[PDB]
């Protein structure tokens, strides 16, 4: 799988899947991504992220 935030490959047997109110599904590879997401930051705007790269 791939982190729906940064874009790197989520190491198997790891991560969290945040289920949204509407039913949407977001697979995170780490708290760092989850937390940057909670700050309203978009992966595209953060350079360290593969999505941006």
């Amino acid at each position: 799988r791939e982190c729906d935030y940064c874009g790197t490959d989520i190491e198997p047997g790891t991560g969290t899947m945040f289920v949204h109110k509407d039913g949407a599904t977001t697979h995170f590879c780490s708290s760092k991504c989850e937390n940057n997401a909670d700050l309203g930051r978009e992966a595209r705007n953060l350079e360290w992220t593969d999505t941006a790269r």
């Binding site: 198997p12 047997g13 969290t16 899947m17 945040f18």
Partner: peptide, 19 residues
């Protein structure tokens, strides 16, 4: 049916809800 605190699945992954 839903809870904010995570739960674990056989494959390791945690799952959590919005409420």
């Amino acid at each position: 049916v839903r809870q904010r605190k995570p739960i674990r699945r056989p494959d390791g992954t945690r799952v959590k809800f919005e409420d």
